[PDB]
C-alpha cells in the first residue's frame, strides 16, 4: 500500500529480453516471443505471481506463489519451486531489470530478464539492460531480444 507503484504495474508484467549462459534455455529463449505476467501482494514476505508465455508449440499459462520473501531485503523464494527472484531494477516507467536464479540438485543458475511497461521497447531499456549484462561479461548471443509477436494470451481471471 505504501507503494502505489506496485499496484500500477501489477496486473500485467511484460518480459521482452533475457540473459543467460545455459545453452539449453538460452537456446530456446531465442525462439520464443514476448511474454506476459500478473503479480499480486499477499504480504511483503509473500506474493502471488503468474507466468504467461506464448509457445507456438503449445501455449503455457499457470500461477505461482512466492513465500518467505524477505531474505536479502526484498527477494522471493519458493521452497517447492527452488527458484527465487530479486528486484534488481524496477521503475515500471519504461522498463525493469530483475535477477532470476534457478537452482537444481547439484546445479545452480543465474539469468537476467528485461521487462517493458509497454509492448514497445525503449532504446534505453535495452541499453541499461545490456550495461548490467556486460558487468557479467556477457556477449550478444548470451542476451536475446524478444518481439511483441503474440499467439496466446492470459485473462484477468
Ligand X SMILES: CCCCC/C=C\C/C=C\C/C=C\C/C=C\CCCC(=O)O
Q: Which positions lie near ligand X, rule CB under 6 A?
A: 6, 13, 15, 37, 39, 49, 51, 85, 87, 90, 96, 98, 100, 113
Residue closest to ligand X, measured at CB: 37
Q: Could you say which DSSP state residue 104 is in?
A: B
User: Shortest Cβ distance from residue 27 to ligand X (Å)?
Assistant: 18
Was 114 annotated as part of a binding site?
Answer: yes
d(CA 59, CA 55): 4
Residue 143 as a binder of ligand EB4 (CB under 6 A): the answer is no
Q: Residue 75's closest CA among 47, 104, 38?
A: 47
Residue 109 as a binder of ligand EB4 (CB under 6 A): the answer is yes
Q: Which listed residue (33, 48, 61, 83) binds ligand EB4 by CB under 6 A?
A: 83
Segment near ligand EB4 (CB under 6 A), from 20-28, 42-50, 114-122, 132-140? 20-28
- Which of left, alpha, beta for 106 (phi over 0: left; psi -120 to 50: alpha)? left
The position carrying cell 499459462 is 61
Alpha carbon separation from 36 to 27, 70, 108, 114, 143 (Å, rounded): 20, 25, 25, 12, 19
Query: Which secondary-structure segment (H or E) carries 129?
Result: helix 123-135
Q: Which listed residue (6, 21, 25, 89) binds ligand EB4 by CB under 6 A?
A: 25
Was 38 annotated as part of a binding site?
Answer: no
Residue 67 as a binder of ligand EB4 (CB under 6 A): the answer is no
Query: Which secondary-structure segment (H or E) carries 131?
Result: helix 123-135
Residues 34, 125 contacting (CB under 8 angstroms): no
| Residues of the binding site for 1-tetradecanoyl-sn-glycerol 3-phosphate | 51, 83, 113-115
Provide the binding-site residues for ligand EB4, judged by CB under 6 A. Answer: 15, 24-25, 28, 32, 35, 51, 53, 64, 81, 83, 100, 102, 109, 111
| Residues of the binding site for enterobactin | 22, 83, 102, 113
Amino acid at each position: 500500500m505504501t507503494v502505489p507503484d506496485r499496484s500500477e504495474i501489477a496486473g500485467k508484467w511484460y518480459v521482452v529480453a533475457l540473459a543467460s549462459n545455459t545453452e539449453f534455455f538460452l537456446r530456446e529463449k531465442d525462439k520464443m516471443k514476448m511474454a506476459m505476467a500478473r503479480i499480486s501482494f499477499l504480504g511483503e514476505d509473500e506474493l502471488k505471481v503468474s507466468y504467461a508465455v506464448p509457445k507456438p508449440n503449445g501455449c503455457r499459462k499457470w500461477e505461482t506463489t512466492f513465500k518467505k520473501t524477505s531474505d536479502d531485503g526484498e527477494v522471493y523464494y519458493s521452497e517447492e519451486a527452488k527458484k527465487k527472484v530479486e528486484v534488481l531494477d524496477t521503475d515500471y516507467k519504461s522498463y525493469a531489470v530483475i535477477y532470476a536464479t534457478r537452482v537444481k540438485d547439484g546445479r545452480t543458475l543465474h539469468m537476467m530478464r528485461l521487462y517493458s511497461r509497454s509492448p514497445e521497447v525503449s532504446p534505453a531499456a535495452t541499453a541499461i539492460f545490456r550495461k548490467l549484462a556486460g558487468e557479467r561479461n556477457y556477449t550478444d548471443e548470451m542476451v536475446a531480444m524478444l518481439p511483441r509477436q503474440e499467439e496466446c494470451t492470459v485473462d484477468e481471471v
